[PDB]
Amino acid sequence: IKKAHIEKDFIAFCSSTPDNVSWRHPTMGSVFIGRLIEHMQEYACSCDVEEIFRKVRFSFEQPDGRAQMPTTERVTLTRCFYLFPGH
């Protein structure tokens, strides 16, 4: 028998910061989910999930009318998670 870490190789990504609200469009859809789709399509080939989710936060950096900041929590990733689309 051999021991192993109970929690490892996890990553959570939320739509807003704690004690704040996320913005959802009634006909177009959630601003966060839409932007995650725009970034994942373009950067899955050259960037990893940590590199991608960092770029996602940057597009929210300018607050006008409605403001929301995505956050990355409880990260136990020891390696780079590259998707490699097409393979």
């Binding site: 004690d19 959802r24 959630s30 994942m40 899955a44 999930v49 390696r79 780079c80």
Partner: protein, 166 residues
């Protein structure tokens, strides 16, 4: 929703990033990837999430364009969510899989995700810790040493998250 057409990676680029600090990837001829989607649109107490079906069309297609097999479960309680999370991990398809993705699209507070039977008097809150406990190496042995990504689309409170400046 969105078309989901992802910009592909070339073999010229794939061989260029070769390392012991990259997660291993299985062969496409035998690998069985799994992605789970849970969305609450219709509610008894709090208002209906109009335009939620657009965000289901986007993610369900994008994850499928990344080789994953998508499962969509609509309008569930906190106790129903807990059973579906245990059923997803108990699937032996994870054994011949390199990664997994999970998306939660409902309402929320500081404590967690709200079910379809949630109210201010009698709540139905699902903590983020309960999700991490069910997906760990103790409860889920099939996903050992593998990436496990979790996406959350819900509120975290009531404040607008903004502060004025000069």
């Amino acid at each position: 929703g969105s078309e989901g057409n992802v910009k592909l990676c070339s073999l010229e680029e794939a061989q260029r990033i070769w390392s012991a600090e990259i997660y291993p990837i299985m062969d496409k001829s035998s690998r069985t990837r799994l992605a789970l989607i849970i969305c609450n649109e219709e509610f008894d107490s709090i208002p209906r999430r109009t335009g939620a079906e657009v965000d289901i069309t986007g993610m369900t297609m994008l994850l499928q364009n990344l080789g994953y097999s998508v499962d969509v479960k609509k309008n569930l309680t906190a106790s129903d969510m807990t059973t579906e999370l245990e059923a997803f991990a108990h699937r032996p398809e994870h054994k011949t899989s390199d990664s997994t993705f999970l998306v939660f699209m409902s309402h929320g507070i500081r404590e967690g995700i709200c079910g379809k039977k949630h109210s201010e008097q009698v709540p139905d809150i699902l903590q983020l810790n309960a999700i991490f406990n069910m997906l760990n190496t103790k409860n889920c042995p099939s996903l050992k040493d593998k990436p496990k990504v979790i996406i959350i689309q819900a509120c975290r409170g009531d404040s607008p998250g903004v502060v004025w400046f000069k």
